[PDB]
Enzyme design. Sequence first.
Site, PDB file in Angstrom:
ATOM      1  CG  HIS A 403     -51.842 -59.351 -37.501  1.00  0.00           C
ATOM      2  ND1 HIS A 403     -52.167 -60.546 -36.893  1.00  0.00           N
ATOM      3  CD2 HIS A 403     -51.307 -58.567 -36.536  1.00  0.00           C
ATOM      4  CE1 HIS A 403     -51.843 -60.486 -35.616  1.00  0.00           C
ATOM      5  NE2 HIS A 403     -51.315 -59.299 -35.376  1.00  0.00           N
ATOM      6  CD  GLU A 404     -49.905 -54.830 -37.226  1.00  0.00           C
ATOM      7  OE1 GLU A 404     -50.516 -54.213 -36.335  1.00  0.00           O
ATOM      8  OE2 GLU A 404     -49.089 -55.732 -36.961  1.00  0.00           O
ATOM      9  CG  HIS A 407     -54.012 -55.237 -34.080  1.00  0.00           C
ATOM     10  ND1 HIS A 407     -54.614 -56.119 -33.212  1.00  0.00           N
ATOM     11  CD2 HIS A 407     -52.729 -55.643 -34.206  1.00  0.00           C
ATOM     12  CE1 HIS A 407     -53.734 -57.023 -32.830  1.00  0.00           C
ATOM     13  NE2 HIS A 407     -52.585 -56.758 -33.420  1.00  0.00           N
TER      14      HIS A 407
HETATM   15 ZN    ZN Z   1     -50.730 -58.066 -33.524  1.00  0.00          ZN
END
Ligand code: ZN
Length: 533
Positions: A403-404, A407
Amino acid sequence: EQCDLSQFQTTSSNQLMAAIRQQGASCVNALFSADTGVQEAAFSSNHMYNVAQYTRTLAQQYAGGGSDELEALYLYLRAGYYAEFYNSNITFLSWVTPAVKGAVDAFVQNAHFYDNGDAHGKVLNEVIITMDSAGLQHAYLDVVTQWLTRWNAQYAEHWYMRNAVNGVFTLLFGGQWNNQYTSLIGEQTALVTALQAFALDRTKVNSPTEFMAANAARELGRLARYTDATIAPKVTEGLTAIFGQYPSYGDGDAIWLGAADTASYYADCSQFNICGFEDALRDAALNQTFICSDTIKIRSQDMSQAQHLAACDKMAYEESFFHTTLETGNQPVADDHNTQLQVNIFNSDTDYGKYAGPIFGIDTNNGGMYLEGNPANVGNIPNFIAYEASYANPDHFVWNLEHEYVHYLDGRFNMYGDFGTPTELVVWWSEGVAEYVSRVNDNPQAIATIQDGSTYTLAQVFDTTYDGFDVDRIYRWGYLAVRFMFERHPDEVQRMLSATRQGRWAEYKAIISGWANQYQSEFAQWTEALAKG
Ligand SMILES: [Zn+2]
Ligand SMILES: [Ca+2]
Ligand SMILES: [Ca+2]
Ligand SMILES: [Ca+2]
Ligand SMILES: [Ca+2]
């Protein structure tokens, strides 16, 4: 057996008190979240005063050993103040709180107040919370000093005693908004002495009560804000003793860091010679180094080589799947030199909570954090920060690793400028794409939030913010909106990205507001076919 919340919606105090004692504390719990109809009926000023009077005389008769009825009664009383805070239709008349203070005092003055034991701890817990919920923090500083002085390994054996006595620290915290308390707290030298000794008790380190010592350290550091008060030399003396006795990294560092967190907020780190501890902390806490590639470096607290390898391998995988799905051509946005990424992984959410705040300057009441820094600066190296978890993805088991990592890719290939640059809401996209690229079609909670009846329009999804931190709206519905567009209108996704990749936030916003009018019906039907299939 069964809770009957309607019994509480009454004008008779006797019927109300019969409902409290006969349904017990676990049913009284329902009053916190009941309808404004039930709350207004149950928490009239008359009921609070009559329940408080009966609670006072039953507490005078208490002879130890716990009490289901007192537990339920004080729970009721503190639930009223809870409802008074959140319910506008509820305001207690002036004569309520003196009666509630009469009920609390009766327990405090009872010969059994300082008894040890689990059943006693249950009632005591509700009494101590009520001291806070009722704004009486100014009235019981001597109770706090007693409990801090009397605490020992024998009280520590009982969960409910730890839980109850931990409530004194919430009381010291709550006193900050109590004008009687702040007028009084500067003279409480005995309390400061007892706080110092409590936190400095080395036998609590690595025990089930270490967290109480850390809270004592925190509340002590808050008292450094009274720079002029009688207590100020002893507060300073206590803080100095904690910083010199415990390490910033190691056994008991939760006590050290608890003190540092509040003492730095209300005074300067130079008073205690702890300025710049964060750098040595970063080196001690993130002491492993694993070079995935010339573009990704891992610093970690305690991972195996196999975790390092699986993390590197999984990020390389996501990179190529990201670039294909987003149609980047591997072309980053302009003024973005963020070619290298640093990955920081703590051993657990607890370690993250202790260490990531000071090291990285972030809030840690979340599942991880990505820090782009300034892409325009030559030599900027962005960081994401994360923690290992047993429920994370194998084989790395780093919570939100994928997830990161998305980003970072989103920030470099889709979103012009640093994190704060946009002048329109991008939360749904940033979080939605981070979830979608990393989970694709495996998202059971996203299916669940469709099936449970509560849903969001595209328009609402696009206007989502971090305020209140609505995880359902942010991550599940952001996911759905992103997934829906990539599946049904991926060409419109690229039109949007032409805007975001150039920082044209007003054009981005005009584009997606078009979607919220065109595709709402298609999106509504789509979420249904998702919940069916
Ligand atoms: Zn997030
Ligand atoms: Ca109110
Ligand atoms: Ca580990
Ligand atoms: Ca960016
Ligand atoms: Ca829902």
